[PDB]
Design a binder for these strands. Structure first.
Ligand code: NA
Ligand code: NA
Length: 330
DNA sequence: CCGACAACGCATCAGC
DNA sequence: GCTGATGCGG
DNA sequence: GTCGG
Protein backbone atom coordinates (compact mmCIF):
# COMPACT_ATOMS: atom_id res chain seq x y z
CA UNK A 1 0.00 0.00 0.00
CA UNK A 2 1.19 3.55 -0.92
CA UNK A 3 2.81 5.67 1.80
CA UNK A 4 0.34 7.88 3.65
CA UNK A 5 2.51 10.83 2.61
CA UNK A 6 1.10 10.51 -0.93
CA UNK A 7 -2.55 11.38 -0.25
CA UNK A 8 -2.74 11.28 3.56
CA UNK A 9 -4.04 14.83 3.80
CA UNK A 10 -6.94 13.90 1.53
CA UNK A 11 -7.83 10.54 3.07
CA UNK A 12 -7.64 12.01 6.60
CA UNK A 13 -9.99 14.77 5.43
CA UNK A 14 -12.46 12.30 3.97
CA UNK A 15 -12.34 10.15 7.12
CA UNK A 16 -13.03 13.12 9.40
CA UNK A 17 -15.98 14.10 7.19
CA UNK A 18 -17.10 10.47 7.33
CA UNK A 19 -17.24 10.50 11.13
CA UNK A 20 -19.27 13.72 11.36
CA UNK A 21 -21.81 12.42 8.84
CA UNK A 22 -22.21 9.28 10.93
CA UNK A 23 -21.96 10.67 14.46
CA UNK A 24 -23.48 14.13 14.06
CA UNK A 25 -25.66 14.34 10.93
CA UNK A 26 -26.73 10.71 11.38
CA UNK A 27 -26.30 10.12 7.65
CA UNK A 28 -24.84 6.60 7.58
CA UNK A 29 -24.80 6.32 3.79
CA UNK A 30 -22.76 9.53 3.47
CA UNK A 31 -20.49 8.10 6.16
CA UNK A 32 -19.83 5.07 3.98
CA UNK A 33 -19.56 7.18 0.82
CA UNK A 34 -16.64 9.08 2.37
CA UNK A 35 -15.04 5.89 3.67
CA UNK A 36 -15.22 4.30 0.22
CA UNK A 37 -13.69 7.42 -1.32
CA UNK A 38 -11.02 7.45 1.39
CA UNK A 39 -10.19 3.79 0.78
CA UNK A 40 -10.02 4.17 -3.00
CA UNK A 41 -7.67 7.15 -2.71
CA UNK A 42 -5.67 5.40 0.01
CA UNK A 43 -4.70 2.60 -2.40
CA UNK A 44 -4.00 5.05 -5.24
CA UNK A 45 -0.20 4.84 -5.84
CA UNK A 46 0.04 8.42 -7.18
CA UNK A 47 0.08 11.82 -5.50
CA UNK A 48 -3.23 13.30 -6.63
CA UNK A 49 -2.87 16.62 -8.46
CA UNK A 50 -6.54 17.59 -8.83
CA UNK A 51 -10.16 16.71 -8.14
CA UNK A 52 -10.59 15.77 -11.79
CA UNK A 53 -7.87 13.15 -11.34
CA UNK A 54 -9.55 11.66 -8.26
CA UNK A 55 -12.96 11.91 -9.94
CA UNK A 56 -11.81 9.02 -12.16
CA UNK A 57 -11.68 6.65 -9.18
CA UNK A 58 -14.83 4.63 -8.35
CA UNK A 59 -16.52 6.20 -5.34
CA UNK A 60 -15.21 9.72 -5.93
CA UNK A 61 -17.85 12.05 -7.31
CA UNK A 62 -18.42 15.72 -8.07
CA UNK A 63 -18.64 16.83 -4.44
CA UNK A 64 -15.52 15.07 -3.16
CA UNK A 65 -13.61 16.17 -6.28
CA UNK A 66 -14.58 19.73 -5.44
CA UNK A 67 -13.39 19.31 -1.85
CA UNK A 68 -10.08 17.88 -3.03
CA UNK A 69 -9.51 21.00 -5.11
CA UNK A 70 -10.11 23.25 -2.11
CA UNK A 71 -7.77 21.15 0.03
CA UNK A 72 -5.04 21.08 -2.63
CA UNK A 73 -5.29 24.84 -3.09
CA UNK A 74 -5.62 25.80 0.60
CA UNK A 75 -4.39 22.84 2.61
CA UNK A 76 -7.79 22.70 4.29
CA UNK A 77 -11.58 22.63 4.01
CA UNK A 78 -13.63 25.54 5.43
CA UNK A 79 -16.56 23.30 6.32
CA UNK A 80 -14.28 20.88 8.16
CA UNK A 81 -12.44 23.70 9.93
CA UNK A 82 -15.74 25.13 11.17
CA UNK A 83 -17.19 21.84 12.37
CA UNK A 84 -13.98 20.94 14.27
CA UNK A 85 -14.24 24.08 16.39
CA UNK A 86 -17.99 23.64 16.96
CA UNK A 87 -18.28 22.59 20.61
CA UNK A 88 -21.57 20.73 20.27
CA UNK A 89 -20.66 18.79 17.13
CA UNK A 90 -17.11 17.95 18.17
CA UNK A 91 -18.39 16.79 21.57
CA UNK A 92 -21.05 14.58 19.98
CA UNK A 93 -18.46 13.13 17.61
CA UNK A 94 -16.05 12.46 20.48
CA UNK A 95 -18.45 10.68 22.83
CA UNK A 96 -19.21 8.05 20.19
CA UNK A 97 -15.72 6.66 20.73
CA UNK A 98 -17.11 5.15 23.93
CA UNK A 99 -18.33 1.64 23.13
CA UNK A 100 -22.09 1.55 23.65
CA UNK A 101 -22.51 5.25 22.92
CA UNK A 102 -23.83 5.74 19.40
CA UNK A 103 -24.95 8.88 17.52
CA UNK A 104 -28.26 8.91 19.39
CA UNK A 105 -26.84 8.62 22.93
CA UNK A 106 -24.03 11.09 22.18
CA UNK A 107 -26.56 13.65 20.96
CA UNK A 108 -28.69 13.16 24.08
CA UNK A 109 -25.72 13.55 26.41
CA UNK A 110 -24.42 16.72 24.76
CA UNK A 111 -27.97 18.11 24.72
CA UNK A 112 -27.98 17.90 28.53
CA UNK A 113 -24.46 19.23 29.06
CA UNK A 114 -22.58 15.91 29.26
CA UNK A 115 -19.73 16.46 26.77
CA UNK A 116 -16.57 14.78 28.07
CA UNK A 117 -15.43 11.53 29.66
CA UNK A 118 -15.17 13.48 32.90
CA UNK A 119 -18.83 14.39 32.49
CA UNK A 120 -19.66 10.73 31.81
CA UNK A 121 -17.70 9.70 34.93
CA UNK A 122 -19.85 12.07 37.02
CA UNK A 123 -23.09 10.69 35.60
CA UNK A 124 -22.87 6.90 35.86
CA UNK A 125 -26.60 6.62 36.60
CA UNK A 126 -27.36 7.92 33.09
CA UNK A 127 -25.31 5.18 31.41
CA UNK A 128 -26.48 1.65 30.61
CA UNK A 129 -24.33 -1.40 31.44
CA UNK A 130 -22.58 -1.42 28.07
CA UNK A 131 -21.72 2.27 28.23
CA UNK A 132 -20.30 1.94 31.75
CA UNK A 133 -17.88 -0.77 30.60
CA UNK A 134 -17.09 1.30 27.51
CA UNK A 135 -16.16 4.20 29.79
CA UNK A 136 -14.17 2.04 32.20
CA UNK A 137 -12.00 0.67 29.39
CA UNK A 138 -12.17 3.64 27.01
CA UNK A 139 -8.39 3.75 26.70
CA UNK A 140 -7.80 -0.01 26.63
CA UNK A 141 -10.40 -0.54 23.90
CA UNK A 142 -8.58 1.87 21.58
CA UNK A 143 -5.25 0.08 22.03
CA UNK A 144 -4.40 -2.62 19.51
CA UNK A 145 -3.42 -6.20 20.31
CA UNK A 146 0.00 -7.52 19.27
CA UNK A 147 -0.08 -10.97 17.69
CA UNK A 148 1.96 -12.42 20.56
CA UNK A 149 -0.80 -11.49 23.00
CA UNK A 150 -3.40 -12.81 20.57
CA UNK A 151 -1.55 -16.15 20.59
CA UNK A 152 -1.51 -16.26 24.39
CA UNK A 153 -5.20 -15.37 24.40
CA UNK A 154 -5.93 -18.15 21.89
CA UNK A 155 -4.02 -20.68 24.00
CA UNK A 156 -6.28 -19.94 26.94
CA UNK A 157 -9.50 -20.01 24.91
CA UNK A 158 -8.71 -23.27 23.10
CA UNK A 159 -7.57 -24.93 26.33
CA UNK A 160 -10.61 -23.93 28.41
CA UNK A 161 -13.08 -24.81 25.63
CA UNK A 162 -11.62 -28.30 25.20
CA UNK A 163 -11.59 -28.67 28.99
CA UNK A 164 -15.36 -28.04 29.10
CA UNK A 165 -16.05 -30.56 26.31
CA UNK A 166 -13.33 -31.95 24.01
CA UNK A 167 -15.95 -32.19 21.24
CA UNK A 168 -16.25 -28.40 20.96
CA UNK A 169 -14.62 -26.78 17.93
CA UNK A 170 -13.31 -23.24 18.39
CA UNK A 171 -11.65 -21.10 15.73
CA UNK A 172 -10.18 -17.63 16.28
CA UNK A 173 -10.99 -15.68 13.14
CA UNK A 174 -10.63 -12.05 12.07
CA UNK A 175 -7.41 -10.55 10.73
CA UNK A 176 -5.53 -12.67 13.28
CA UNK A 177 -6.45 -15.84 11.39
CA UNK A 178 -5.01 -14.26 8.24
CA UNK A 179 -1.73 -13.67 10.09
CA UNK A 180 -2.13 -10.01 11.08
CA UNK A 181 0.67 -8.61 13.25
CA UNK A 182 -1.97 -6.99 15.45
CA UNK A 183 -5.70 -7.14 16.12
CA UNK A 184 -8.39 -4.80 17.35
CA UNK A 185 -10.18 -7.55 19.26
CA UNK A 186 -10.68 -11.33 19.42
CA UNK A 187 -13.43 -13.10 17.51
CA UNK A 188 -14.10 -16.73 18.44
CA UNK A 189 -16.41 -19.03 16.47
CA UNK A 190 -17.71 -21.96 18.51
CA UNK A 191 -19.59 -25.08 17.50
CA UNK A 192 -20.42 -28.54 18.82
CA UNK A 193 -21.69 -31.64 16.96
CA UNK A 194 -24.76 -31.73 19.21
CA UNK A 195 -25.76 -28.40 17.67
CA UNK A 196 -27.10 -28.34 14.10
CA UNK A 197 -29.50 -26.13 12.14
CA UNK A 198 -32.53 -28.35 12.70
CA UNK A 199 -32.24 -29.67 16.25
CA UNK A 200 -31.97 -28.48 19.85
CA UNK A 201 -28.64 -28.57 21.69
CA UNK A 202 -29.49 -28.12 25.36
CA UNK A 203 -29.35 -24.27 24.99
CA UNK A 204 -26.31 -23.81 27.22
CA UNK A 205 -23.38 -24.82 25.01
CA UNK A 206 -22.29 -21.19 24.90
CA UNK A 207 -22.97 -20.49 28.57
CA UNK A 208 -20.71 -23.36 29.66
CA UNK A 209 -17.75 -21.88 27.79
CA UNK A 210 -18.26 -18.30 29.00
CA UNK A 211 -18.62 -19.53 32.57
CA UNK A 212 -15.36 -21.47 32.37
CA UNK A 213 -13.52 -18.48 30.92
CA UNK A 214 -14.81 -16.37 33.82
CA UNK A 215 -13.83 -19.17 36.22
CA UNK A 216 -10.15 -18.95 35.27
CA UNK A 217 -10.56 -15.17 35.39
CA UNK A 218 -9.96 -14.66 31.69
CA UNK A 219 -13.30 -13.02 30.88
CA UNK A 220 -13.69 -9.99 33.14
CA UNK A 221 -16.90 -8.27 31.98
CA UNK A 222 -20.03 -8.98 29.91
CA UNK A 223 -21.50 -6.48 27.44
CA UNK A 224 -24.20 -8.80 26.14
CA UNK A 225 -24.86 -12.52 26.31
CA UNK A 226 -27.48 -14.71 24.70
CA UNK A 227 -27.81 -18.36 23.72
CA UNK A 228 -25.75 -17.89 20.54
CA UNK A 229 -23.71 -14.71 20.95
CA UNK A 230 -21.47 -13.34 23.69
CA UNK A 231 -19.70 -9.98 23.62
CA UNK A 232 -17.43 -9.07 26.49
CA UNK A 233 -14.04 -8.18 27.89
CA UNK A 234 -11.01 -10.30 28.74
CA UNK A 235 -7.49 -9.88 30.09
CA UNK A 236 -4.39 -12.08 30.12
CA UNK A 237 -2.92 -12.82 33.56
CA UNK A 238 -0.19 -10.36 34.53
CA UNK A 239 3.43 -11.40 35.06
CA UNK A 240 5.48 -11.02 38.26
CA UNK A 241 5.99 -7.35 39.16
CA UNK A 242 5.06 -6.66 35.54
CA UNK A 243 2.76 -4.12 33.93
CA UNK A 244 -0.70 -5.71 33.86
CA UNK A 245 -2.08 -6.34 30.38
CA UNK A 246 -4.76 -4.00 29.03
CA UNK A 247 -8.36 -5.22 28.86
CA UNK A 248 -9.47 -6.57 25.50
CA UNK A 249 -12.73 -7.00 23.62
CA UNK A 250 -13.72 -10.56 22.90
CA UNK A 251 -16.82 -11.84 21.13
CA UNK A 252 -17.79 -15.52 21.09
CA UNK A 253 -20.46 -16.94 18.75
CA UNK A 254 -22.09 -20.36 18.85
CA UNK A 255 -22.89 -21.49 15.30
CA UNK A 256 -24.71 -24.65 14.16
CA UNK A 257 -22.34 -27.35 12.91
CA UNK A 258 -23.67 -27.28 9.34
CA UNK A 259 -23.13 -23.51 9.16
CA UNK A 260 -19.82 -23.37 10.98
CA UNK A 261 -17.39 -23.26 8.08
CA UNK A 262 -19.42 -20.66 6.18
CA UNK A 263 -19.06 -18.60 9.36
CA UNK A 264 -15.32 -19.15 9.73
CA UNK A 265 -14.86 -18.09 6.09
CA UNK A 266 -17.02 -15.00 6.52
CA UNK A 267 -15.56 -13.92 9.87
CA UNK A 268 -12.02 -14.43 8.61
CA UNK A 269 -12.37 -11.96 5.74
CA UNK A 270 -11.00 -9.71 4.64
CA UNK A 271 -14.13 -7.76 3.72
CA UNK A 272 -12.52 -7.01 0.37
CA UNK A 273 -11.90 -10.73 -0.09
CA UNK A 274 -15.45 -11.67 0.93
CA UNK A 275 -16.66 -9.16 -1.65
CA UNK A 276 -14.53 -10.55 -4.47
CA UNK A 277 -15.47 -14.10 -3.44
CA UNK A 278 -19.21 -13.48 -3.30
CA UNK A 279 -18.90 -11.87 -6.72
CA UNK A 280 -16.86 -14.66 -8.25
CA UNK A 281 -19.45 -16.93 -6.64
CA UNK A 282 -22.41 -15.32 -8.38
CA UNK A 283 -20.94 -15.51 -11.89
CA UNK A 284 -20.70 -19.23 -11.07
CA UNK A 285 -24.35 -19.46 -10.07
CA UNK A 286 -23.77 -19.27 -6.33
CA UNK A 287 -24.49 -16.92 -3.44
CA UNK A 288 -22.36 -17.03 -0.29
CA UNK A 289 -23.22 -15.21 2.94
CA UNK A 290 -22.28 -15.68 6.60
CA UNK A 291 -24.49 -18.76 7.07
CA UNK A 292 -24.54 -20.78 3.86
CA UNK A 293 -23.84 -21.24 0.15
CA UNK A 294 -26.85 -21.89 -2.06
CA UNK A 295 -27.37 -22.58 -5.77
CA UNK A 296 -29.59 -20.54 -8.07
CA UNK A 297 -32.35 -21.61 -10.42
CA UNK A 298 -32.99 -20.39 -13.97
CA UNK A 299 -34.83 -17.49 -12.29
CA UNK A 300 -32.80 -17.13 -9.12
CA UNK A 301 -34.80 -19.39 -6.81
CA UNK A 302 -31.87 -20.40 -4.60
CA UNK A 303 -32.52 -23.99 -3.63
CA UNK A 304 -31.70 -25.35 -0.19
CA UNK A 305 -28.23 -24.74 1.33
CA UNK A 306 -25.41 -26.95 0.06
CA UNK A 307 -23.56 -29.29 2.49
CA UNK A 308 -20.35 -27.81 3.86
CA UNK A 309 -17.87 -29.68 6.07
CA UNK A 310 -14.93 -27.33 5.58
CA UNK A 311 -13.87 -24.06 3.98
CA UNK A 312 -12.40 -25.85 0.96
CA UNK A 313 -15.85 -27.29 0.21
CA UNK A 314 -17.11 -23.75 -0.34
CA UNK A 315 -14.21 -23.03 -2.68
CA UNK A 316 -14.84 -26.26 -4.60
CA UNK A 317 -18.48 -25.36 -5.26
CA UNK A 318 -17.32 -22.23 -7.09
CA UNK A 319 -14.25 -23.86 -8.66
CA UNK A 320 -11.79 -21.61 -6.86
CA UNK A 321 -8.75 -23.38 -5.42
CA UNK A 322 -8.84 -23.01 -1.64
CA UNK A 323 -6.88 -19.91 -0.69
CA UNK A 324 -5.02 -19.84 2.63
CA UNK A 325 -6.31 -17.22 5.09
CA UNK A 326 -2.85 -15.66 4.72
CA UNK A 327 -3.66 -14.80 1.11
CA UNK A 328 -7.18 -13.43 1.64
CA UNK A 329 -6.38 -9.70 1.72
CA UNK A 330 -8.53 -9.47 -1.41
C1' DC B 1 -34.77 11.31 -11.13
C1' DC B 2 -34.52 8.64 -7.30
C1' DG B 3 -33.79 4.07 -4.70
C1' DA B 4 -29.93 1.22 -2.72
C1' DC B 5 -26.34 1.55 0.15
C1' DA B 6 -26.79 -6.14 4.49
C1' DA B 7 -29.02 -8.77 7.66
C1' DC B 8 -29.02 -9.77 12.41
C1' DG B 9 -28.22 -10.75 18.13
C1' DC B 10 -28.83 -8.62 22.21
C1' DA B 11 -30.26 -4.81 25.37
C1' DT B 12 -33.55 -1.57 25.93
C1' DC B 13 -37.18 1.51 24.73
C1' DA B 14 -42.09 2.59 23.13
C1' DG B 15 -46.63 1.52 23.49
C1' DC B 16 -50.62 -1.53 24.14
C1' DG C 1 -47.07 -8.31 31.48
C1' DC C 2 -46.00 -9.08 26.16
C1' DT C 3 -44.84 -7.44 21.22
C1' DG C 4 -42.61 -4.89 18.19
C1' DA C 5 -39.27 -0.95 17.21
C1' DT C 6 -34.98 1.15 17.88
C1' DG C 7 -29.97 1.66 19.20
C1' DC C 8 -25.76 -0.38 18.88
C1' DG C 9 -22.24 -3.18 17.39
C1' DG C 10 -18.91 -5.91 14.22
C1' DG D 1 -22.35 11.28 -1.52
C1' DT D 2 -22.06 8.09 -5.26
C1' DC D 3 -23.77 4.90 -8.22
C1' DG D 4 -26.71 3.08 -11.73
C1' DG D 5 -31.54 1.31 -13.33
NA1 NA E 1 -15.73 8.38 -9.76
NA1 NA F 1 -19.59 4.22 20.38
Amino acid sequence: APQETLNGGITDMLTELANFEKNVSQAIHKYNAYRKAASVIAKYPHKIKSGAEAKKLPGVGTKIAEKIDEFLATGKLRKLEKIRQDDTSSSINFLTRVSGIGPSAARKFVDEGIKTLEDLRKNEDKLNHHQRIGLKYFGDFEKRIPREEMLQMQDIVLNEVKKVDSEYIATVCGSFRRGAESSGDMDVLLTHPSFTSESTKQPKLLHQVVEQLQKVHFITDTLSKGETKFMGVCQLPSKNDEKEYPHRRIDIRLIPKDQYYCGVLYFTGSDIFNKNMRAHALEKGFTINEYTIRPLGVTGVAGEPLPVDSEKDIFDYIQWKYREPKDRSE
